[PDB]
Amino acid sequence: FGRDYLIPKPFDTRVLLWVAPEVAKAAMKSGVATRAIEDWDQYRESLEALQGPSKVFIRSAINRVHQNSAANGGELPRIVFPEGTSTKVLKALATLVEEKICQPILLGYPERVKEKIKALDIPLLNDVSIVHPSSHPKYFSFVEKLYSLRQRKGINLGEAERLMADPNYFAAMMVNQGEADGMVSGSSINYADAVRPI
């Protein structure tokens, strides 16, 4: 509570529980009520029941992500999407960046993805970073890392190099090392293949 907070926010789920019974109190006390609410708690219960998750869960989710952003110096989460040429992914990202949900990072050959973004008429993603795995500065550093963790699980330097050029492994490694805060994949590939490098 303060100079920047004088009232509840519009979509506050608590408005109903505190206002409806006090209004009830005023109605009964003023004699304009024709049936009294006696069980105040059973009523508060009934009131909680009316605004369940099917109506508000995602609302609160997005609100919470925004508040998280505010408390973090305004920084948005870097979420990498390795299937940068996937039309469903791009279409989602239009909405997602419009409503400020994350900082998307796309993976692939820059020309192909820019052609795709133009083909689909999504003007909101012209700012989004696009990286080709082999051409990233930390690439070789990443391959080293993979090597060191999987050298006795069938992966040597050659193989590490080969894999890290795969957008899935690259996304995974970025997240691992903190060069991204999270990743979303599997839009155009079966789940096992998408989840395995993770």
Binding site: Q151, R152, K153, N156
Partner: protein, 193 residues
């Protein structure tokens, strides 16, 4: 095995030498165990190793597989595990696995592809994942390679006893009995102690 038996914690295991120009290789178990466990392969390695030490050589042990450091389900996992156990029992030795045979014997290959490995300078002790592989290897090398092969020598038993390969030649027997003599003398001494 019924009369004399194994010594404490030992495992009966056949062992051969391949006498090359720069080195000798020890192959085990070439005769007894169909499909030894990780735990058994480790013990076999230990027995081979102490024999190599008797001849004043540093044992360097590789657990052979069809795989290179994959540890995949099956023989890779068994040999990788065997190497781990061996290393715990004899922490001073170079013991490594899972690896293929050329990776094992050839230090250049080892350095080029798998420098992380703790096996350096090539292995002189090769322990096999199953009886098919060991028995066939030593017999093939003996026939078509151009190197003397001696053995098998029965390892793991309390007293001195060795079983010839029935395909042996007379010089084969001559060599085998030499090493049985060596063993016989060693055990007598130790006992007499």
């Amino acid at each position: 095995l019924q009369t004399i038996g194994v010594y404490k914690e030992g495992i009966p295991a056949g062992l051969n030498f391949v006498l090359l120009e720069d080195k000798f290789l020890v192959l085990a178990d070439t005769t007894v165990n169909l499909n030894p466990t990780a735990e058994q392969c480790a013990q076999i390695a230990l027995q081979a190793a102490k024999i190599v030490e008797y001849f004043g050589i540093e044992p360097r042990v590789a657990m052979l597989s069809y795989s290179n450091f994959s540890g995949a389900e099956g023989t890779p996992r068994k040999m990788k595990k065997a190497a781990e156990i061996a290393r715990s029992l004899r922490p001073d030795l170079m013991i490594e696995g899972d690896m293929q045979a050329d990776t094992a014997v050839n230090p250049e290959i080892m350095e080029r592809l798998f420098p992380f490995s703790g096996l350096k300078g090539g292995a002189n002790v090769l322990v096999f994942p199953n009886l098919e592989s060991s028995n066939i290897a030593y017999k093939l090398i003996q026939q078509i390679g151009k190197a003397e092969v001696i053995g098998p020598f029965l390892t793991g038993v309390r007293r001195s006893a060795n079983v010839l390969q029935r395909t042996t030649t007379v010089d084969g027997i001559v060599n085998s009995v030499v090493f049985t003599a060596l063993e016989a003398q060693y055990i007598k001494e130790v006992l007499k102690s």
